[PDB]
């Protein structure tokens, strides 16, 4: 009820770095602002890892088999992640800016393109325990003149070639005794060689440069070595390459041009399959599978991802998020639905497990600000600075009726009665609470009495009276029913905003400018008690701040407050790095949460590093966009004083760490907050962290573990084999004294398998008590996994309660029958 | 491999006074002739205060400022049992043949320990507590 | 001895130990290789950043350290490690059982001496090769040649000449041949330290007297001498920077600096390293730089520089004294109490008998910084109480820290040795803060903990009073009196509502914190030595003198679990991050690990050392032990966060072909089982040689023969078998068959069937027993029926429980 852990980050589908699929084409790895998201395409689910990076990610790969994940910052922070286990194994620091990490197809060793250096390291072992210094640098190849921009292995591990912004594209081996076999360099291009490749046969070499050129290198005659047999030019006129991949087993080039165009070729032939305009915005990364039938693009001009097939004209996902523009967030009464609004207008509909915008609504023209659900999560509304509140349903996914005012006025916040007629909106301009009927587009009442803006509004779940927040430091509670049209002010003394009611509707959380949240009675007028937030808020000092965070007034209030589903807790969130969980009656915060730990995010750090405070100025506040190799990144369009305006590049600043919208789940007390980075999910759904067991097996290994007394691990080694002789060996082998010791430590992966094995075998078995202890220990062990996914165990549990009643409770009814006949026949008397 | 040693008692083995007991938070029965540490029992966390051999099999190790006497088995190399005073053990004496042990406690108390090697039972509480207090109080 | 849940990662918090460290160069720059027991460390000299650690703990402690350019040569017991980058590339195990004393590197050779007064020679397999692997020979020093081998050096421009110095004299060898090319005469003092020289032919020797001898070999003569009054020399070094300067390191901690041209000492440093821990253990000028790196046995490694000379006209005469430069220190004594400071497992507080805190950083070994003990100027104005010879704070027995309001006031409370109060410290300012918190009943502080709101520190006396001081102004709030013995562990709940305390009276007191009432008072058996609380899950654990940790629920106001199982005084113990486990360590050299939902010791680590403090990280990753010897903090990776391990009760015992399997009939005798085959027999039955065999089982008073064919009797024939029971007066075959059934349920197999036979008795002779109710013969056997019968409600307690849980879990 207190312990909330990070579960999943949603959206902002690409910022910076390399995109990769796994061994299988299911798992797609993308960078987020500092995290890695994994999108599984067929089993449509999304995931983002529990950790974050310290700067923006500029390099990424995963293992051959999907065991290790390497994320590397812009600076060269490297993070070793147990990819199957989602836990961080090692933080190494590469001291140079690297651009490419690629594992071996062997999986034995990976390599790194940092500067003009190639660093080739051995892989750390996953089944081995975590060590202090796991990484062993095998070799370092520094035969390059400028920064090495692209890098590949062969399909054998024994050949690696890298390419730089220097003209060179150079092959070596892993091992130096394989140096003499092939160790040479390629030149003769015009420009940045942006990608050089082996073919699927290791005899043809493809080298692609920025100018639009490919050479077909081949170890051929006029001993004799390595001529160009042909060149290939796509003849892009002013456009030039940004990114290039090559799928070798089908001989396919994916190109990304500066003009947002992209081409496909068949490389011994060099024949144009199709040209797609991905957009105005260039492909910043291309990717193929080992199957080579999906392609993955990312535009870091927009922040979009695109999985599209080359052979069939068909996308998989065309996802386009919006940074700094996650305005509203909305839990449904159902715990399966989530609504995110935006300043661009898009209002997306997410599942919490499968993190996909299932729906969107791109019909608002301006910023959408406040969204509440009503009537069992059927209808869902959207007040806007677009001058309207547009209604939305979750069955037809359509606009119902765009409630309008007179003078086309923007609307600050939205409140919906559960009785689905009454929708109130407060305005940032007009400061009159407009009440719309849902059935009639006319306004029901123009509630007047706000001097300065109406900040926020909510109704009770109980009496459905509304509480609006002035900027005149004064709550106005309106009771519009019983034909009174009656009002009451509550004077606060400092400037309130972000109002939030208890579900009982007799107490209200208020956030003043002091940070002090107050709780107000509604059946009476006085203040109940007030909890302080100006002390326990993590605020950040910007690099351009000229005052320390201890006496900074940047973010020590709260831009959103929410009551818990008992009404006994509150999660509040503001323009800070800090999200807070106060207890309502005990009146002291339970836990304080970071939203994001990113140096490029501005107000993350409490204390700035004094090595960056130079003579006159920061060390980071110097304009470094003027040194980019590309003209477009050297172009500055930043208008000076734009605060949360349209695009990212036009702040002329780092993005502030701010969290706009905060809500609780009804069911499992999970709270989600749409941040600057995107929607974050904290939950109490603990042990959804997926945990592989006993990773590489014989039947002898589990049976030797029976001889080795390693009985839970022997059960795992049996259940990976799935032969019922072994399961009845290992099942009756463990003693009773460690049955609940075993069953609480069973993963959820074999949970329907073990529940079905118990549910089937125990029906015909004499070990009724022994099976019964297993079902007791399992249902007391991990019944919560059957609380969430009921249809997952529905076949197994059916057999289980077949065994409980027909097989076991028949024996019990026999027992109680003979018992009660004993009690009668020994407690009563005779005759004669 | 004994860089700190502040307590010593020699064993009543007979005319052979070899294999004596040295201790500072960690005890070694060490031979005189073969110049080697023979038996090593972990003492206490604190520097050891009292180091008393009772019998042919059992000896008391005492910690400075701690409330726990440990009765160690000589040849078994493990603790036979523990005694625990009401407060910090300040001084120690024992009877002839492991009958009853006098613990002067640091708070000011006398804990007696009756048949300390008798038959869980491994935690041995203070049997008797002899305090001394004036007439007026 | 091996752990399954945790594993050793590194011993955090150590810089050196006193073993003479080695210096090396990469190109222009310098690295330093020091020893910590069985693990060596490498440093840049220009920042004292940690560069490498050993890939393995060595099986015995490293005795010697030498270092060439990329290869660091460690030397433990019989074997010598050739390490590149802290990784064992080549172990060279010497052909004695003698212990390796000293070591040196020159040419294509390696030379290492043992304590059998014999040096071993190890050639490279080629000059093309880089590390020496070929075993050349063993030469020795007999007692006409020299004494005990103090050092092996190679003075430069000496072709295959090995300079072996003893306490007596100096020898020179051709290690290609193996011939003693020269023996020096005895110096009359006991030579203790050698050092080569940037001049030719000279070896500097610092003896057991305060005497340093410059000694030639081409002369064979002691060219100059240098005296020291009453100090035992430990290290010698030469400043090769540009003025001829000599470094004399005592074992009294003092460093003496000479200029041999002016024939004068320059400055003597006092007490740069602790005298009791070896004095100055090794000091060495970095070659061609005015920087001397000093290393003490106080887990400290300092740097000093000569400033360039102020005299423009002179230079060499006017010398600035050496000046403090960067240093990595550790706890000189072993650490008494540790804790995990922050939430993200970045910092650990470690307090020792060195009388100091240290704020170690498990992220980066250089952010590890020693805390200040500098009092704020007292807010009252009247001056404070203490000696003007300001000593360190007395060593600490308890720690307390909450990072809720960090850096707005103090948030570290430390219970110093034998002080009636306890000081407060800012974690952020790395310095003891303004308030000190008293007992106010004239007893010692014996346990402290702080409020999670960061506004209260709780202080428990030796006389029982618990004061609640405020972290705002240092003011007290309430002084609770429940215990008349000592308090020994305090906590608050995570909501700051209900506060617990454990005492040396055997009392755990439940008080409210918002309210002021004593809510509950649980009396446990032994007095209670410590208290650990889990804020996320509202439990609290305690060690007592009953060698066993009781975990007490704070809601249900009673014991939830007690782990018996230890063998000695339980030193430290800790919950998990999530309350699933408790790590305990006791004086029994065991560190056991406990799964509290069940309550079984699921693994115990046997250690060579006694583990004093264990500390589970608030993150689910790290376990910190501190031992009684050893000054660092053993960090342990928690494998459960990575894959898993087994959870068995396996501690006290230490401390196929046909791919098919017939079922076991009965696993243990205590469990109940049914009849092999059809379950439908109950549904059938419920919807003479026989009586002779029943008699022959009755005369045995064991009826195990009857039950066999009783299962195997055809179900319709039993409808005449029980309907002929021969009992009118004696009721024998009634009592014979009923006791046959009760002996049938005794082995618990075919449990349902004897119930069916009992109900078939009621179908057959319920009137024959009923009209003769009160008869003490059949009533005895039915009393025996109830006594055997009353256990098996445990499956009715299983079936109803498991059924309701199944329905409740499927529906909700």
Per residue, what are the HEC states of C38-107? CEEEEEECCCCCEEEECCCCCCCCCCEEEECCCCEEEECCCEEEEEECCEEEEEEECCCCCCEEEEEEEC
Tokens of A446: 């123009």
Q: Alpha helices, DSSP H only, in A262-393?
A: none
Consecutive H or E run containing A608? none
| Residue with token string 């707005």 | C408
The answer to whether the beta carbons of residues A196 and A150 sit under 8 Å apart is yes
Give CA–CA dist B86/A451, Å, rounded.
72
| 764-793 in chain A: CB under 8 A from chain C | 764-770, 772-773, 775-776, 779-780, 783, 786-787, 790, 793
**B-chain residues within 8 Å CB-CB of C60?**
none
The answer to whether the beta carbons of residues A389 and A381 sit under 8 Å apart is yes
Q: Alpha helices, DSSP H only, in A208-337?
A: none
Nearest 5°: CA angle at A139, between A135 and A143?
A: 135
**C-chain residues within 8 Å CB-CB of B26?**
610, 628-629
Tokens of C428: 């952020």
| Cα-Cα-Cα-Cα dihedral sign, residues C386, C388, C390, C391 | negative
Consecutive H or E run containing C463? none
Contacts of C28 by beta carbon, 8 Å cutoff, 6+ apart:
none
Tokens of C307: 């400033």
Nearest 5°: CA angle at B94, between B91 and B95?
A: 150
Consecutive H or E run containing A32? none
**A-chain residues within 8 Å CB-CB of C786?**
822, 826
The answer to whether the beta carbons of residues C522 and C510 sit under 8 Å apart is yes
DSSP letter, residue C640: G
A122/C contact by beta carbon, under 8 A: no
Q: Do C547 and B122 touch (CB under 8 A)?
A: yes
Contacts of A631 by beta carbon, 8 Å cutoff, 6+ apart:
none
Pairing of strands A466-469, C590-595: unpaired
**C-chain residues within 8 Å CB-CB of A810?**
682-683, 752
Give CA–CA dist B80/B124, Å, rounded.
11
φ/ψ of residue A221, rounded to 5: -80, -165
Q: Do A769 and C671 touch (CB under 8 A)?
A: yes
Q: Do C569 and B82 touch (CB under 8 A)?
A: yes
- Neighbouring CB atoms inside 10 A of A788's CB total 14
Q: Smallest Cβ distance to C812: which of A91, A737, A787?
A: A787
The answer to whether the beta carbons of residues C701 and C695 sit under 8 Å apart is no
Which has the closest alpha carbon to A525: A481, A462, A584, A476?
A476
Strand order in the sheet with C100-106: C100-106, C109-114, C118-124, C132-140
C768/B contact by beta carbon, under 8 A: no
**C-chain residues within 8 Å CB-CB of B123?**
526, 545-548
φ/ψ of residue A226, rounded to 5: 60, 70
**C-chain residues within 8 Å CB-CB of B122?**
547, 567
- Neighbouring CB atoms inside 10 A of A462's CB total 14
Q: Do C643 and A695 touch (CB under 8 A)?
A: yes
Residue B106 CB-half CA count within 13 A:
15
The answer to whether the beta carbons of residues C643 and C603 sit under 8 Å apart is no
Select from C777, C810, C811 the residue whose CB has the most chain A CBs within 10 Å, as the one to mutate to test that interface: C810
Q: Do A819 and C789 touch (CB under 8 A)?
A: yes
Tokens of C776: 């003490």
Give CA–CA dist C184/C167, Å, rounded.
12
Which has the closest alpha carbon to C648: C5, C109, C1?
C5
How was this model experimentally determined? cryo-EM
- Looking at B43-107, which runs of residues are DSSP E strands? 48-53, 58-63, 68-73, 79-84, 89-94, 100-105
DSSP string, A333-361: SSTT-EEE--SSS--EEE-SSS--EEE--
| Cα-Cα-Cα-Cα dihedral sign, residues A505, A511, A517, A523 | negative
The answer to whether the beta carbons of residues C499 and C458 sit under 8 Å apart is yes
φ/ψ of residue C188, rounded to 5: -70, -10
Q: Do C779 and A737 touch (CB under 8 A)?
A: no
| Cα-Cα-Cα-Cα dihedral sign, residues B85, B89, B90, B92 | positive
Q: Nearest-CA distance from B99 to chain C in Å?
A: 22
Task: Name C82's bridge partners.
Answer: C73, C90
Q: Smallest Cβ distance to A745: which of C363, C637, C647?
A: C647
Give CA–CA dist C767/A741, Å, rounded.
50
Q: Is C711 helix (H, G, I), strand (E, B) or coil?
A: helix
CA distances from C790 to A770, C40, C778, C794 (A): 18, 66, 18, 9
C17/B contact by beta carbon, under 8 A: no
Give CA–CA dist C602/C217, Å, rounded.
66
The answer to whether the beta carbons of residues C146 and C177 sit under 8 Å apart is no
CA distances from C402 to A537, C174, C412 (A): 15, 66, 7
| Cα-Cα-Cα-Cα dihedral sign, residues A823, A824, A825, A830 | positive
Q: Smallest Cβ distance to A808: which of C673, C682, C799?
A: C799
Measured between its terminal Cα atoms, the distance across chain A in Å is 68
Chains B and A touch (3+ CB pairs under 8 A): no
Q: Smallest Cβ distance to C545: which of B44, B78, B84?
A: B84
Q: Is C14 helix (H, G, I), strand (E, B) or coil?
A: coil
User: Following CA atoms C377, C379, C384, C388 in sequence, which dihedral angle do they give, to the nearest 10 degrees?
Assistant: 10
Q: Nearest-CA distance from A826 to chain C in Å?
A: 7
**B-chain residues within 8 Å CB-CB of C628?**
25-26, 42, 45
Tokens of C745: 């349920």
Give CA–CA dist C625/C632, Å, rounded.
9
Q: Do B45 and C526 touch (CB under 8 A)?
A: no
The answer to whether the beta carbons of residues A16 and A56 sit under 8 Å apart is yes
Strand order in the sheet with C369-370: C335-340, C347-352, C357-361, C369-370
DSSP string, C357-380: EEEEESS-TTS-EEPB--PPPPSS
Give CA–CA dist C72/C62, Å, rounded.
12
Contacts of C763 by beta carbon, 8 Å cutoff, 6+ apart:
C722
φ/ψ of residue A687, rounded to 5: 70, 25
Give CA–CA dist C83/C39, Å, rounded.
12
Which pairs with CB-CB distance under 8 Å and at least 24 residues apart come from C323-326?
A: C325/C291, C326/C47, C326/C48, C326/C302
Give the residue on A whose Cα is nearest the Cα of C796: A812
Query: In angstroms, what is the C-alpha Rg of chain B?
Result: 15
Residue C275 burial by CB count (10 A; 0-12/13-18/19+): exposed, middle or buried?
middle
Give CA–CA dist C715/C439, Å, rounded.
81
Tokens of C469: 């001081």
Which has the closest alpha carbon to C535: C415, C453, C657, C422?
C453
CA distances from C322 to A372, C258, C270, C293 (A): 71, 12, 11, 11
Give CA–CA dist C20/C34, Å, rounded.
7
**C-chain residues within 8 Å CB-CB of B125?**
526, 545
| Cα-Cα-Cα-Cα dihedral sign, residues A348, A350, A355, A356 | negative
φ/ψ of residue A190, rounded to 5: -110, -30
Measured between its terminal Cα atoms, the distance across chain B in Å is 51
- Looking at C417-517, which runs of residues are DSSP E strands? 421-426, 431-438, 445-450, 456-461, 465-470, 476-481, 487-492, 498-503, 507-512
Consecutive H or E run containing C803? helix C793-811
Residue C219 burial by CB count (10 A; 0-12/13-18/19+): exposed, middle or buried?
exposed
């Amino acid at each position: 009820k207190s312990d909330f852990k990070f579960s999943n980050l949603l959206g902002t589908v690409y910022r910076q770095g390399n995109i990769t699929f796994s061994d299988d084409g299911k798992q797609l790895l993308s960078p987020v602002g500092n995290r890695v998201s994994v999108f599984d395409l067929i089993n449509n689910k999304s995931f983002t890892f529990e950790y974050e990076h310290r700067k923006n990610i500029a390099a990424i790969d995963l293992n051959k088999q999907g065991t290790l994940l390497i994320s590397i910052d812009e600076d060269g922070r490297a993070i070793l992640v147990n990819f199957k286990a989602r836990n961080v194994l090692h933080h190494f620091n590469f001291k140079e800016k690297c651009s490419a990490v690629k594992f071996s197809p062997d999986g034995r060793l990976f390599a790194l393109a940092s500067g003009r250096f190639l660093q080739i390291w051995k892989t750390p072992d996953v089944n081995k325990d975590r060590q202090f210094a796991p990484f062993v640098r095998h070799r370092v190849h520094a035969g390059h003149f400028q920064d090495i921009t692209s890098l590949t292995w062969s399909q054998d591990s024994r050949f690696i070639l890298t390419t730089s912004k220097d003209l060179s594209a150079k092959i070596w081996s892993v091992d130096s005794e394989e140096k003499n076999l092939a160790a040479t360099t390629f030149n003769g291009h015009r420009d940045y060689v942006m990608g050089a490749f082996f073919s699927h046969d290791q005899e043809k070499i493809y080298t692609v440069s920025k100018d639009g050129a490919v050479f077909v290198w081949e170890f051929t005659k006029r001993k004799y070595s390595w001529r160009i047999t042909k060149k290939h030019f796509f003849y892009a006129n002013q456009a030039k390459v940004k990114c290039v991949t090559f799928h070798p087993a089908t001989r396919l080039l994916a190109v990304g041009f500066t003009s947002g165009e992209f081409r496909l070729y068949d490389l011994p032939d060099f024949t144009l399959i199709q040209q797609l305009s991905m957009g105005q915005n260039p492909v910043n990364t291309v990717s193929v599978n080992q199957t080579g039938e999906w392609l993955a693009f990312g535009s870091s001009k927009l922040g979009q991802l695109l999985v599209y097939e080359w052979q069939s004209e068909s996308y998989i996902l065309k996802q386009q998020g919006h940074f700094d523009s996650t305005n509203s967030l909305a839990y449904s009464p159902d715990g399966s639905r989530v609504v995110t609004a935006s300043e661009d207008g898009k209002i997306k509909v997410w599942d919490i497990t499968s993190g996909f915008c299932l729906a969107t609504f791109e019909e608002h023209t301006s910023s959408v600000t406040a969204v509440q659900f009503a009537k069992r999560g059927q209808v869902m509304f959207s007040s806007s600075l677009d001058g309207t509140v547009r209604a939305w349903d979750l069955i037809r996914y359509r606009n119902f009726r765009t409630f309008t005012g007179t003078e086309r006025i923007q609307f600050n916040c939205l409140a919906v009665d559960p009785s689905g007629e009454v929708v109130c909106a407060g305005s940032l301009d007009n400061f009159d609470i407009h009440v719309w009927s849902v059935q009639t587009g006319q306004l029901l009442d123009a509630l007047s009495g706000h001097e300065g803006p109406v900040s926020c509004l909510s109704f009770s779940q109980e009496n459905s009276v509304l509480a609006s927040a002035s900027w005149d430091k004064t709550i106005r509670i309106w009771s519009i029913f019983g034909r009174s049209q009656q009002v009451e002010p509550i004077e606060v003394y400092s400037d309130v905003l972000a109002l939030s009611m208890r579900p009982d509707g007799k107490e209200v959380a208020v956030s003043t400018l002091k940070g002090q949240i107050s709780i107000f009675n509604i059946e009476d007028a006085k203040q109940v008690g007030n909890i302080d937030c100006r002390k326990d808020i993590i605020s950040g000092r910007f690099n351009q701040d000229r005052f320390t965070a201890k006496n900074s007034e940047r973010s020590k209030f709260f831009t959103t407050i929410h009551y818990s589903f008992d009404g006994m807790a509150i999660v509040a969130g503001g323009n800070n790095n800090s999200i807070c969980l106060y207890d309502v009656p005990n009146e002291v915060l339970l836990k304080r949460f970071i939203v994001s730990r990113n140096m490029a995010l501005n107000g993350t750090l409490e204390f700035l590093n004094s090595k960056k405070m130079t003579e006159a100025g920061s060390l980071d506040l110097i304009d470094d966009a003027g040194e980019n190799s590309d003209l477009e990144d050297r172009i500055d369009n930043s208008l000076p004083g734009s605060q949360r305006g349209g695009d990212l590049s036009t702040r002329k600043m780092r993005p502030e760490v701010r969290v706009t919208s905060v809500q609780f789940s009804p069911t499992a007390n999970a709270f989600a907050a749409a941040s600057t980075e995107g929607l974050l999910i904290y939950s109490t759904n603990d042990t959804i962290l997926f945990d592989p067991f006993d990773l590489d097996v014989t039947p002898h290994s589990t049976v030797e573990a029976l001889r080795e007394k390693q009985f839970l691990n022997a059960l795992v080694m049996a259940f990976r084999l799935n032969e019922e002789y072994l399961i009845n060996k290992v099942y009756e082998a463990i003693p009773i004294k460690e049955i609940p010791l075993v069953a609480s430590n069973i993963p959820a992966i074999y949970l329907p398998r073990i529940l079905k094995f118990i549910g089937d075998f125990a029906i015909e078995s004499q070990h009724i008590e022994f099976n019964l202890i297993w079902i007791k220990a399992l249902l007391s062990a991990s019944g919560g996994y059957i609380n969430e996914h009921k249809y997952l165990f529905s076949t197994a549990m059916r057999s289980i309660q077949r065994f409980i009643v027909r097989v076991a409770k028949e024996v019990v009814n026999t027992t109680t029958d003979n018992k009660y006949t004993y009690r009668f026949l020994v407690s009563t008397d005779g005759s004669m | 491999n004994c860089v700190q040693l502040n307590k010593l008692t020699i064993v009543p083995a007979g005319d052979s006074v070899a294999q004596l007991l040295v201790a500072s938070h960690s005890i070694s029965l060490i031979d005189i002739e073969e110049k080697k540490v023979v038996m090593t029992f972990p003492g206490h966390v604190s520097p050891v205060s009292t180091l008393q051999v009772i019998t042919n099999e059992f000896f008391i190790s005492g910690a400075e400022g701690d409330r726990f006497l440990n009765v160690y088995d000589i040849h078994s190399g493990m603790t036979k049992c523990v005694l625990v005073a009401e407060s910090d053990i300040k001084e120690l004496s024992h009877s002839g043949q492991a009958d009853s042990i006098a613990v002067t406690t640091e708070d000011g108390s006398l804990e007696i320990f009756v048949d300390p090697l008798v038959s869980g039972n491994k935690s041995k509480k203070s049997s008797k507590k002899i305090q001394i207090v004036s007439k007026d109080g | 001895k091996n752990s399954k849940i945790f594993s050793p990662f590194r011993i955090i918090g150590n810089v050196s130990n006193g073993v003479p460290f080695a210096t090396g160069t990469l190109g222009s720059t310098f690295y330093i290789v020091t020893c910590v027991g069985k693990t060596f460390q490498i440093y840049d000299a220009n920042t004292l950043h940690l560069l490498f650690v050993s890939e393995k703990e060595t099986p015995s402690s490293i005795v010697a350290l030498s270092a060439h350019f990329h290869y660091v040569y460690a030397a433990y017991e019989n074997k010598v490690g050739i390490y590149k980058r802290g990784i064992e590339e080549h172990l060279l195990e010497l052909e004695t059982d003698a212990n390796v004393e000293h070591l040196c590197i020159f040419g294509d050779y390696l030379c290492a001496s043992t304590d059998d007064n014999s040096i071993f020679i190890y050639k490279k397999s080629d000059p093309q090769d880089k590390y020496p692997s070929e075993f050349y020979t063993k030469l020795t020093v007999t007692e006409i040649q020299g004494g005990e081998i103090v050092s092996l050096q190679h003075l430069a421009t000496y072709l295959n000449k090995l300079t072996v110095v003893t306490k007596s004299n100096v020898l020179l060898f051709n290690v290609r041949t193996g011939k003693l090319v020269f023996t020096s005469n005895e110096f009359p003092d006991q030579i203790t330290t050698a050092e080569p020289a940037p001049v030719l032919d000279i070896i500097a020797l610092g003896t057991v007297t305060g005497e340093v001898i410059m000694f030639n070999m081409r002369k064979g003569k002691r060219i100059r001498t240098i005296k020291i009054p009453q100090s035992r020399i430990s290290s010698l070094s030469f400043r090769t920077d540009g003025s001829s300067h000599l470094s004399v390191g005592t074992s009294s901690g003092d460093l003496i600096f000479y200029d041999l041209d002016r024939r004068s000492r320059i400055h003597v440093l006092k007490n740069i390293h602790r005298e009791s821990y070896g004095g100055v253990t090794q000091a060495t000028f970095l070659n061609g730089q005015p920087i001397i790196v000093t290393s003490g046995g106080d887990n400290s490694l300092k740097e000093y520089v000569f400033d360039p000379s102020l005299s423009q006209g002179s230079g060499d005469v006017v010398v600035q004294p050496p000046r403090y430069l960067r240093s990595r220190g550790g706890h000189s004594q072993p650490p008494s109490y540790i804790a995990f400071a922050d939430s993200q497992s970045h910092f650990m507080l470690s307090a020792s008998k060195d009388r100091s805190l240290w704020s170690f950083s498990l992220r980066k070994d250089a952010q590890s910084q020693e805390m200040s003990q500098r009092l704020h100027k007292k807010q009252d104005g009247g001056r404070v109480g203490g000696s003007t010879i300001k000593s360190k704070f007395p060593e600490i027995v308890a720690l307390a820290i909450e990072n809720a309001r960090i850096g707005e006031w103090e948030n570290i409370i430390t219970a110093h040795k034998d002080e009636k109060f306890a000081r407060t410290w800012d974690m952020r300012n790395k310095r003891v803060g303004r308030w000190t918190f008293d007992t106010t009943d004239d007893g010692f502080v014996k346990s402290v903990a702080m409020s999670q709101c960061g506004n209260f520190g709780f202080i428990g006396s030796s006389n029982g009073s618990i004061t609640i001081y405020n972290m705002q102004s240092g003011i007290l709030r309430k002084k609770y009196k429940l215990h008349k013995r000592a308090v020994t562990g305090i906590s608050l709940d995570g909501m700051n509502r209900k506060m617990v305390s454990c005492g040396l009276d055997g009392i755990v007191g439940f008080y409210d914190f918002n309210k002021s009432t004593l809510l509950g008072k649980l009396k446990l058996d032994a007095p209670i030595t410590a208290m650990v609380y889990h804020r996320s899950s509202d439990l609290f654990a305690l060690a007592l003198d009953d060698l066993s940790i009781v975990v007490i629920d704070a809601v249900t106001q009673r014991v939830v679990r007690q782990l018996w199982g230890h063998s000695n005084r339980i030193t430290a113990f800790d919950f998990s991050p999530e309350g699933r486990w408790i790590v305990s360590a006791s004086l029994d050299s065991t560190i056991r690990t406990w799964d509290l939902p069940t309550g079984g010791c699921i693994d115990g680590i046997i250690v060579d050392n006694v583990a004093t403090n264990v500390k589970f990280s608030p993150n689910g990753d790290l376990l910190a032990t501190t031992h009684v010897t050893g000054n660092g903090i053993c960090i342990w990776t928690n494998r459960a966060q990575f894959k898993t391990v087994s959870t068995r009760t396996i501690d006290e015992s230490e401390f196929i072909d046909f791919n098919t399997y017939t079922s076991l009939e009965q696993i243990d005798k205590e469990l109940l089982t049914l009849s092999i085959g059809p379950r439908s027999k109950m549904n059938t039955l419920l919807h003479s040689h026989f009586t002779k065999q029943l008699r022959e089982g009755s005369q045995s008073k064991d009826y195990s023969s009857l039950l066999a064919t009783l299962i195997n009797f055809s179900p319709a024939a039993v409808d005449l078998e029980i309907r002929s029971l021969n009992s009118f007066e004696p009721f024998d075959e009634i009592v014979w068959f009923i006791d046959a059934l009760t002996q049938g349920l005794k082995s618990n197999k075919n449990f349902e069937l004897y119930e069916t036979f009992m109900s078939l008795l009621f179908k057959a002779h319920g009137d024959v027993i009923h009209a003769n109710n009160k008869n003490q013969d059949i009533a005895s056997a039915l009393q025996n029926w109830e006594d055997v019968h009353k256990k098996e409600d445990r499956l009715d307690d299983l079936v109803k429980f498991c059924m309701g849980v199944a329905a409740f879990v499927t529906t909700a």
